[PDB]
Each structure stands twice: as C-alpha cells, then as structure tokens.
C-alpha cells in the first residue's frame, strides 16, 4: 500500500555523526531497489547474505538504514570484521551480518571552505562495540591510571574529536556519507517488498 | 535519470479553468508516487494534490472539490485540472516523484497568475 521511506535517508540534506549514526526503521511498505543500484551513484556497493537483483524477490520483517558520515579511507572498517578507530569504537558490523554496505563521496555537501567541524567521531573507548552498538556518552576518558572525575587532564581526554572536512583535502580525508541496510527476517510477519 | 516537465503554466481570470501537465521521463520505476505542489511568495511549499501507491487521489482542503490529479498510464503524465481558480491559487506549481521509494525528484515549476 505505501512506498518505503528510504528517500529520506539517500536525499537526506545532513547526516549524522558516526558516534551518534541514524537508524530508521522500516516496515509496511514497497521499494524497488533496481533503483538504488541503477543509479549508479555508489562507489561502494557490498552485499553479504544476499544478491542487490534478488532483492526485489524478497520480503522481510523489517529492514534497518543506518546513516552517518565517515572519511574516505575509514570505508573499508564497515565490513565484517575489521578493526580501527570506526569499526572499533563508532559502529561495528556483524560478523554474520546481512545486508548491503552502500557508500558515496559527500564533499560537495559535506565540506566548505574553511573547514566543516560539525562531524565528530570516539576517538577513545575502554572496550571495543558489540555489532550495532551505540554509544553517545561524553564522559571523560582516562588514559593514565588517575580519575579524571569528569575533566580533562595529563592522560585524561575528552573522548570525541572533529574531522575537519574541506573541499581541497585529498580523498582519502574528504567525507563519504554512509548508508547500511540490514535485512531482519524473525517468525513475525514479513510486511517489506518489492514489485510482486 | 529521472526528468519533470511542467507545462500549462499562465494568466487566467479568477472563476475561469486551467489544466497542468506533468511529463516525466527518465528510468522511472513501476512503484511511484506523483504529486503537484504549489508555492506562493513568501510561503512555503505546500502539496495541493496526489495520487497515492494504491491509486487514490488526495487533495488539500483549499482546493479539494475544486482540483482534479489525473495520471495518464501510456503517456507517463500526471494531470492536474483546476477549476473556479481563485486568487489564492496564485503560485508557483511542481510536481515531485518519489522513485521506488529511494529518491524523490522535483521540477523547476510553472507559473499561475490568478488575475482579472
């Protein structure tokens, strides 16, 4: 009866930070997702557990996009099982995940002259996430071995720092907006679907 | 990849009629929804008519039983036929498509001038 709401997701006029990345979910309605891969407009297209054709074929209980903005060569940590500063410490994948890893360069929306500050992501944690794991604290990391009590000092940090995109940066620091679509099918009713 | 055309656009007297067109083309999916919309000067864009998945049109209060939307299968067109304008109707007019539920698409507007 309805079309999926994913356009407000891909046309979406700011993302997310990737500390604090954006789930929609979405249930009840139609997409044709010949639409995502005709586009063309996805430099990284990756999916586990399923095929980006056979995907009109099938419904499912719900499916989840998770938005955010990352830089250029952190792309590669949004797969199963990586490690770094994102994967790490920002969003982690399952390793049995399922789903599609959809990726594209965003330095025309996402960078100005003079440097855009306003993206941020966990440079220090205690522990890795579990796979997708949320954290938005901003509580005081401590590096050293002395209570920093809720403020910054010697080997005491506070644990979110700014990526700083411009337009002039190489593209490995220029900034990719980030959508990951996870397929959930439970013993509930699966309700997503393509033209059937 | 995905085009819209508005055509129609004019001066027309308050209580008189006119139609609006809407050509789309480009790689259109076979789920999608179309709309008109209209934008007068200092106000914000405002859906005046649709027509929904399942094929039922929707209207807004200020132009319900007045505005007719009317989409043409073979002629990928979406119609919008007005009647009894009134000087309110005064706007800039755009028809959106969402495309297969990822992208929705704009065109650039025709003008209606409602004046005696």
């Known amino acids: 009866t309805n079309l999926c709401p994913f356009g407000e997701v891909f046309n979406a006029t700011r993302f997310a930070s990737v500390y604090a990345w954006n789930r929609k979910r979405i249930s009840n309605c139609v997409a044709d997702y010949s639409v995502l891969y005709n586009s063309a407009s996805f430099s990284t297209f990756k999916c586990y557990g399923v095929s980006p054709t056979k995907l009109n074929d099938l419904c499912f209980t719900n499916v989840y996009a998770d938005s955010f903005v990352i830089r250029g060569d952190e792309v590669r940590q949004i797969a199963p099982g990586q490690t770094g500063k994102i994967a790490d410490y920002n969003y982690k994948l399952p390793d049995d995940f399922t789903g599609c890893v959809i990726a594209w360069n965003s330095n025309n929306l996402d960078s100005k002259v003079g440097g855009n500050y306003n993206y941020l992501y966990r440079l220090f944690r205690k522990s890795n996430l579990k796979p997708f794991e949320r954290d938005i604290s901003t509580e005081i990391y401590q590096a050293g071995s002395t209570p920093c009590n809720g403020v910054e000092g010697f080997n005491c940090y506070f644990p979110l720092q700014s990526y700083g995109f411009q337009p002039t940066n190489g593209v490995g620091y220029q900034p990719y907006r980030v959508v990951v679509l996870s397929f959930e099918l439970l013993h509930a009713p699966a309700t997503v679907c393509g033209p059937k | 990849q995905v085009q819209l055309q508005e055509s129609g656009g004019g001066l027309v007297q308050p209580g008189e009629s006119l139609r609006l067109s809407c050509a789309a083309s480009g790689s259109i999916s076979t789920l999608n929804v179309m709309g008109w919309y209209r934008q007068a000067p200092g106000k914000q864009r405002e859906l005046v008519a649709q027509?929904?998945?399942?094929?039922?049109?929707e209207y807004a209060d200020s132009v319900k039983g007045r505005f007719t939307i009317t989409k043409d299968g073979a002629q990928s067109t979406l119609y919008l036929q007005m009647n009894n304008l009134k000087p309110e109707d005064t706007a800039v007019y755009f028809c959106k498509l969402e495309n297969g539920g990822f992208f929705y698409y704009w065109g650039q507007g025709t003008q209606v001038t409602v004046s005696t």
């Open positions: 027509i929904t998945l399942d094929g039922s049109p």
